[PDB]
Amino acid sequence: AYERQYYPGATSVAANRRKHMSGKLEKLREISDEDLTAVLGHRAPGSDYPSTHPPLAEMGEPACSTRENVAATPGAAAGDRVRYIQFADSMYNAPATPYFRSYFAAINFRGVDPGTLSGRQIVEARERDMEQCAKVQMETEITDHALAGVRGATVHGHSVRLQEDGVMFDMLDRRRLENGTIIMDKDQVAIPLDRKVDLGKPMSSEEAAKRTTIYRVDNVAFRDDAEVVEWVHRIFDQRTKFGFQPK
Amino acid sequence: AADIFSKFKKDMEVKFAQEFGSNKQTGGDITDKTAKFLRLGPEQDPRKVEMIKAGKEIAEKRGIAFYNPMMHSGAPLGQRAITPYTISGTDIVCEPDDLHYVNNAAMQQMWDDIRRTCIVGLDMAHETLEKRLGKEVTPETINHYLEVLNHAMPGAAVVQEMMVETHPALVDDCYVKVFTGDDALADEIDKQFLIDINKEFSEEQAAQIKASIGKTSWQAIHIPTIVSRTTDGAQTSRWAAMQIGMSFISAYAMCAGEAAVADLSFAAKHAALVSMGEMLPARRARGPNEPGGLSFGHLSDIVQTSRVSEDPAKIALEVVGAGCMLYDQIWLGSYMSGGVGFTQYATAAYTDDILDNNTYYDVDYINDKYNGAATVGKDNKVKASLEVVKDIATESTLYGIETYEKFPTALEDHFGGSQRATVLAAAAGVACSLATGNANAGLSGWYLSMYLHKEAWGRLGFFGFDLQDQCGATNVLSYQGDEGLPDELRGPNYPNYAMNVGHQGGYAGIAQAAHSGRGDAFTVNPLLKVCFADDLLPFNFAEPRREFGRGAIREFVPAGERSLVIPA
Amino acid sequence: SDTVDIYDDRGKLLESNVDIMSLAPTRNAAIQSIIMDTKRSVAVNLAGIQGALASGKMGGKGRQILGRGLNYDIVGNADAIAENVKKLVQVDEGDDTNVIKVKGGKSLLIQSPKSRIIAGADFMSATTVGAAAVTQTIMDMFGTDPYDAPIVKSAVWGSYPQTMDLMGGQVQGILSIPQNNEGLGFSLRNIMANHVAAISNRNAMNASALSSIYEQSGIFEMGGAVGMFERHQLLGLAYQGLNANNLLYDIVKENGKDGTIGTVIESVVRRAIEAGIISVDKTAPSGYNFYKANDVPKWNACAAVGTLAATLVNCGAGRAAQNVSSTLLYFNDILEKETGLPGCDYGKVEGTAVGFSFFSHSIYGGGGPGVFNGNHVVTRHSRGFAIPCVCAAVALDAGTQMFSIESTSGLIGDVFGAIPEFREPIKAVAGV
Amino acid sequence: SDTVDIYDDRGKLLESNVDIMSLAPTRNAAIQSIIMDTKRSVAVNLAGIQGALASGKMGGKGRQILGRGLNYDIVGNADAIAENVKKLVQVDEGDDTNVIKVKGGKSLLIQSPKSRIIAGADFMSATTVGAAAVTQTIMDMFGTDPYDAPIVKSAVWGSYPQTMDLMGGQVQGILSIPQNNEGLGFSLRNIMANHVAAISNRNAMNASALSSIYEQSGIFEMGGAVGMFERHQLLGLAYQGLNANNLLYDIVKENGKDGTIGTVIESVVRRAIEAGIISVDKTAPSGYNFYKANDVPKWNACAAVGTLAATLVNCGAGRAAQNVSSTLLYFNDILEKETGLPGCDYGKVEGTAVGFSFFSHSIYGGGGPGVFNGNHVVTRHSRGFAIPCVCAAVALDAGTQMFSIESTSGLIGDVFGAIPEFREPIKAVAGVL
């Protein structure tokens, strides 16, 4: 029986990376089912999930061992559309970094299609399955809602200087600090919501620095986590050697 | 190095801490992590205002919708500050839009000057005249041939009666010069036709070129830009061959169309032709002399900085700039896609002295740790190894990352992860090439940078940025058929490289760096190095980055315009 | 001497103690039979020809030649046409020529005798002779006037020879045309993922099996399996492609109910340690164990199996083809971070998956997983270890794609899916 | 059905009563052996690799990578290299892999086992496996450091894969690469005439014989010999290519001393009338006889023989290759004007010859006769009846060409010219080797 170790390193950043990868994330706030559906913007809150094809139980499936041995998710079974949740995360110590959101999704959720980019990270999945993953990302420490933002388009901000109130720039102003709490009053493609969503009080810069999976020279320097630099060196060496001759 | 670091900081001050147009960025500390975003929209930028006005008027005039910033989702461009770019190594401050290739005649002309150029040997042609016709080829007959050729090449007649011809005013950029590794012949060539290798290159570099090509003679042909623009790259070698054939017929009193002429044709079109680049496979089908066929070594040799500078980093950096512009803005950003395209994917590597800062830091690090290995020399280089690559590339990348982190202005500047990846990896790769004299050690450094970058920030580039970078380290020293290749011979059609921005210009700089560190005359082809050692070409290939700046400020005069035949 | 036991798609033992060298495209009779049949066979759309003749719609998208209509009952004469086509396609009486009426006369399977492939440099004789046979047959059967001959010809051949292919024609094979090859030895890699899934009848592991056979036949023709690289590629073919030792099947099964890309990594690393293929090289201060591969080609094969197993689990759970691009990326990326060992193909599956993800989620090109193939600029880079997963992923899709199997490969699946060795390739290679 | 007697290049009977169907590429074992050997074989220039390694001159015209020199004695270790290359190229112990040292170790013949062609879609495995075997062998033998591996690789492979071919590499075969095909079924047509003449050892009729085998194998793969067109092409192959009934040899011999393109026409028409292949159809007022062909494919074969016979006579007289383009044009042009019957390939040999003449006498492209092939845009047009004459013409040239056999095809002649079935293809087909 193999116990996964996930990631090297012995700093707070490496420890936080293992927390994200293993899905051991502290719940910090609550979002209702309807508010989650509202911010995602794929259907009216509380409405039935639209479908892209009939339920598996209705149309039937080919009989092969994989379909028999691999259980379809509730979203696949229902024939849901594949929809998404996408985040931008500030490089100024947002808890999340793009690759580690994707690892979080790949390791802890079934039937997911994560994508990593510098300014955006996305999980595509059958809509109801996606909402399960979305809820954890919205509620737990993997997201600070000042330093991050749910953005399905026009994502610019991850590398831009922070606003003086500690909130990451949004071209389309979907969420901001109001009375010491983060309010989101548009969905992730910036269509105004009927009801604004309280995404809770932001982390202090101090707490963000402790919870972040990003290295920075003025918090926890990458150079100082020798194990992770060595890991890179070992992967590099081995890839180079085995490309010449796999021995 | 200190001077470049000061230049980088000045760039950040100009870009972020003093107003550009009406963006109201009237002050600030370039190390500050925070900023105020004014939500001014596109009107903060005078070029954008000009574009909006033109878009409105043209839409009204032509009767169908056109440029309109309000069609942008959510809000128009410029909700944060629209800020300028300074061309690296210069004080030329540019409107961002003026660096889009469509808006920049210098950028378009650099490509036209490459596209409309090929090199054709003379020796085979002369052997043909000697063997088949019994003709005696002398300096006199060659000089007469060259004057006939420089009449014929732009599109003028030498044999038939009742010919129409191209208007000289439309094709004034078309000409043919010659060069030769035979010093005795070079002394006899009418100087108006000669690219003098002994004059244009240092004694060491001239020796390398002449030893490489031997006592052989070559034509540097540049066909009309207006023709290149009407047609394509594959036009070039055909155009050159037609008028070479006509000029041999006329100058040597051959039958105007005999069997021996066909040998001159095959010599000019195939046997003694050197193209800028070769054809591309079906999915990206293109004939010769298109950007995808242009090997990284060939671009390094078209760029003339190696001839006029003794600074190996400067030489590499000019090639990076030229390559990022051509390969990303015109090739990948237009030929292979289009639209708004990839201006700033490229500008990150030739503006605001950020790449230069990382690179010159590396040079000092290498010189300090490796007994001046980054200074010009062939016998002061470090043996390429995994150890040396890991040392230099890791140090390079850590410094570059720390600079982005200590200067939030630099991070906002290169806002895309791909831009930062290109800069960090280019510096690391160029550094490894400089220290080792091994271009593929440079490639290894490039890929190691990407790997360190990814783990440092938990992000790298865009969705498909590191297809080649994850295939990268393992394919550097592979000798498998479609994997192995020296970087000098690699290019945009090397399978891993065939798609994605942010790389090809860097690889060209890495190829160049391996040879500039050695003081080599060329990176892979002396024929191209000499061909473009010529100030008559409209684009100054010795200063490609600065040329882009001259284009931005509308002081670059291109060839190929049609105002002569256009109404008032 | 590396041997494996071959298990089928349902995890049942087929053959024990098979030398992996006997599985080489260059030695294996079943694989060579699949290659020969792929080379020598084409589908002809008889209903398409009939419609093209009547309407003038031939030669490409939007094309119609007005005023030249020919009303020939092609489909109603399908049996007589098949018979005459066989007479023209065959080289000797009673040879291995096979012309079969498909879908109630709407199409034909035309299998040239192997003599046409033996006497040819490549595989285009199947297309040219097939098209010529059909063209001559229609000309004779319906008594076409010579001045209408061009119309009958292009109903079959489309815009060839103005185009390099039979654009807007009615003849298709599993392969493309040789000129579409990106590299040397790439012909058998230019097979659309939707084609393979169609032929497999949407059986995921048989799709990845057949794809593996094509891909490795390509790598062999590329000269990418010479010397030490032969064992390297054959371990991959055996384990990832042919379910060697039931490893693929067992890993999928134990992760099938609740498994993710992440749990498949646990299965792969646990089994690799159990088999002695990898062991701890060094333990860091944090407790992190850096591993070393004791058999590098075998470790690569473990990673290859894991990549496909993760695809079957993750695409299987979603019943969605698109999950394959991220699966190939993150299985290998996360595997490297778990172990300190390089992923499958030493980064090249991960790399292929990075661009493959991009070009299946962006504006720039590509498309859904089904349009990709080993000759595609996006997905060529890995040495045969990525595309088999794509074929399996497409087979598992329950209906999320615009460019589905039916959309791109309906004719191919109908014409070629009935060939036993094609539909059951693991059993074919095992010798049943 | 149709039978012919096969005569060799010296006009001697080899086999009688040969059914022309047995001569089909799709049925004939000897032709299939020639095709297989052509597919599975490449030449490697060991001297070239050694020079490239030392100088860095690799990857194409003008290319040199400075400062990366490797001094390996490739030629001096040619036998050991050949041994190890065979071990890497072979598939089964004791199979039909063949690796031979040629030119005192300056080059190798690498013949892959048939299994690589059987398991392959086309023919490039001979090149890629051959190059891979040489690359691996040099890497091992000379202990190349991994950071020098790219230099060893490109010494062999040139600019591949930046280029689609091994540009500036040291591996060549008789064929090209598949992507150079203009049409479908054209791979065996992409063989330059100089190659065939080199392999034939400048034997005119064996050059045209081998070319006919390649060309008609191409026409067959093009699907241009289906149904009635099979007899049509095989009559051409038998008569023009394989000297059926000694007609080609006899027509050349009786026109050899003093004959011209014009007198060859007299021979062709006289013999066609004697054989009953053509008859007077109608006589015009002037007395001019309009002929009719009683057997159209046979008449075409007569015109095909006449075209090659005229080439052998006209190019032979001048010992000059260039005469072939006008010979193909005017033999058929004048034949039509003599008889009122269509020339060979019903105008297409004449047509091919019109453009071929132009593109071997002008500024626009082409070259001397030796650069052309059945896949060349200029000379593809006739169904295999033109290029065999070009190969014979090149074989007869005494030294008028810049792009001679030695210039373009020296390695090919050295490496492939000693293969018995290649140098004596008529004897191969008659089964008398």
Ligand code: F43
């Ligand atoms: C719509 C896509 C999907 C796709 O296939 N391509 C896009 C868009 C495309 C469009 C954007 C033009 C427009 O606004 O209409 C163009 C210009 C290509 C074109 N059609 O001309 C482009 N990308 Ni993109 N794109 C770019 C970038 C990026 C970076 C931006 C990150 C950030 O924080 O701002 C991210 C990827 C990443 O996160 O790494 C990105 C994504 C995307 N890129 C996401 C949209 C993301 C969003 O919603 O904002 N680009 C860059 O990082 C720099 C270069 C820049 C390109 C323009 C230029 O080079 O000047 C542009 C290049």
Ligand SMILES: C[C@@H](OP(=O)(O)O)[C@H](NC(=O)CCCCCCS)C(=O)O
């Ligand atoms: C993949 C391929 O597209 P297709 O899948 O064939 O449609 C290819 N495009 C590109 O590679 C475009 C690359 C430049 C734009 C993206 C840059 S990161 C091409 O058009 O030939």
Ligand SMILES: C[C@@H](OP(=O)(O)O)[C@H](NC(=O)CCCCCCS)C(=O)O
């Ligand atoms: C024959 C071929 O030339 P090559 O033999 O390949 O050099 C071809 N030229 C042409 O067909 C040129 C045609 C236009 C000029 C002559 C018009 S009659 C080409 O360049 O691809």
Ligand SMILES: O=S(=O)(O)CCS
């Ligand atoms: O967002 S994507 O990475 O697909 C395109 C970047 S320009």
